[PDB]
Structure 1
Amino acid sequence: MRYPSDIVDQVLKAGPDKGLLTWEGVDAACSHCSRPIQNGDLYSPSSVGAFFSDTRDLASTSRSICWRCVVLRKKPMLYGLSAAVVTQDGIYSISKDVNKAWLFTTPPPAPFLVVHSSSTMQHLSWRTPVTLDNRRIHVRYGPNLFIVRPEVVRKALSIADRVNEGQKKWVTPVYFDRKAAAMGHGLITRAGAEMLTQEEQEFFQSVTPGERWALSYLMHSKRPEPEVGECITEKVMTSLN
């Protein structure tokens, strides 16, 4: 519940691969997940391929992967956590917009860990911190480390439901990009320029990029009700074995 690699044996039960070396000597942190490798725990020397391009998100330059993050670099872990929230009892999916509606509005009370892929297969699990508090959520989205406050998401959603109550067409006040890629991601629309007051506009610039990315999955004409995502920890474990 402290390091992102803890879910290897806390969220989902797993063990070392038994071809891993035993650490002898002084303390050194794992290159992935920033977990200190003590004396006696199993570790692997660093054998990343040339296709690994996340050297900028490595926690340390010790060139040693802890066994939990050896499990975390496995391909079934890589496509199993392409969109997943890992609570203290299981791994659930956030692929649907109703699942992100559940995650960023009334979050689960566990100290979870949120990963989401901005591409096909990405190293997501180890390079994000564990969110200890529901109010402050660390979301990994591709090369982006995002922080989402569900209270600010609730305030923006209440603002949007106020300015779009009674109207026939649900027009968004501020445009949000799902990929977080367009220039106008966070830019105020003309309808939102005419239908929001000044302090609401400064609020919509003042939100964090993670809240913008979350609102991108929950600001559209059909509004997703918070529905808990389907539990996928059985699918990941079966794939892992």
Structure 2
Amino acid sequence: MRYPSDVVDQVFKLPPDKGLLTWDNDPVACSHCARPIEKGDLYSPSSVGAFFSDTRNLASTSRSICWRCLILRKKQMLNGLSYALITQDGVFQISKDTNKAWLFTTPPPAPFFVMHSSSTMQHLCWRTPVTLDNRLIKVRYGNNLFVVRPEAIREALEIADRMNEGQKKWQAPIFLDRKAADSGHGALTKAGREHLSAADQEFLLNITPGERWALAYIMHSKRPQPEEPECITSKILEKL
């Protein structure tokens, strides 16, 4: 899998819609997934409407949308892929905290896309870049493009465990917000400020925003136990 639109024909196996124009000009990328639209490929002109708030994330100004993206842009597809992890095998739901911990500590090997909506409904799937290697996971949370490294997540979890192994009252070394919205997101808490060594503080201050967002779900007083998410592509196909 190479493009976000590749999930349609590879895990949803949906044939293209009808009434679609056929490109008969010089190739140009899809305005959504940057996929080339060569001669003979089925496309459709852009008709996003006045409620499209993702003009900044458009891959190109070609005003053309491939059929895979047209399938992806359906309301049933948007709602189904709000908290979805699309691997080669199928589509899983990472909405639960345990699923997030499993994904960010024991990721699947194959290429996969990670989606997470920050609101009721958002355009995600055609914006998420593919994660080619599980060591450098690219996560699209709403409008933010996050890079999550599972090794850094594990190291931060170990740092917290060493910090709070003895004290009965568990305290978060770093202030984290699940929405990545608080003005104190990523700042060191007091307990971590005078209970962590210089190296651990330096490591905590030098984590990517995506790692802070992930730890905002995985790092708590009682760490969630990782579990495999349930397959969802059947539900999405049935509702489509």
Q: How does 1:78-227 map to 2 (within 5 A)?
A: 78-227=78-227
Shift of 1:192: 0.5
Identity over aligned residues, as a percent? 73
User: Cα RMSD (Å) of the superposition?
Assistant: 0.8
1:20 is matched with 20
2:40 is matched with 40
> 1:87 is aligned with what amino acid?
T
> 1:113 is aligned with what amino acid?
F
Once residues 56 and 35 of structure 1 are traced to their aligned partners in structure 2, the CA distance between those partners, rounded to angstroms, is 17
Mind listing any 5+ residue stretches in structure 2 that lack a counterpart?
Answer: none
Once residues 25 and 68 of structure 1 are traced to their aligned partners in structure 2, the CA distance between those partners, rounded to angstroms, is 19
Q: Residues 75-113 of structure 1, C-alpha deviation per residue, up to 9 Å, x if partnerless?
A: 111010110110110000000000000100010111000
Mind listing any 5+ residue stretches in structure 1 that lack a counterpart?
Answer: none
Shift of 1:166: 2.6
Once residues 34 and 164 of structure 2 are traced to their aligned partners in structure 1, the CA distance between those partners, rounded to angstroms, is 45
Once residues 148 and 77 of structure 1 are traced to their aligned partners in structure 2, the CA distance between those partners, rounded to angstroms, is 25
> 2:34 is aligned with what amino acid?
S
Q: Residues 108-162 of structure 1, C-alpha deviation per residue, up to 9 Å, x if partnerless?
A: 1110000000010000000111000000111001110000001111111111111
Once residues 14 and 161 of structure 1 are traced to their aligned partners in structure 2, the CA distance between those partners, rounded to angstroms, is 46
Once residues 141 and 203 of structure 1 are traced to their aligned partners in structure 2, the CA distance between those partners, rounded to angstroms, is 23
Aligned residues: 240
So what's the TM-score if we normalise by structure 1? 0.98
> For 2:65, what is the secondary structure of its paired residue?
strand
> 2:55 is aligned with what amino acid?
T
So what's the TM-score if we normalise by structure 2? 0.98
1:55 is matched with 55
Once residues 2 and 51 of structure 1 are traced to their aligned partners in structure 2, the CA distance between those partners, rounded to angstroms, is 28
2:67 is matched with 67
Q: Residues 11-44 of structure 1, C-alpha deviation per residue, up to 9 Å, x if partnerless?
A: 2211111121100010100000110111111111
> For 2:118, what is the secondary structure of its paired residue?
coil
Q: Tell which deviates more after alignment, 5-14 or 115-124.
A: 5-14
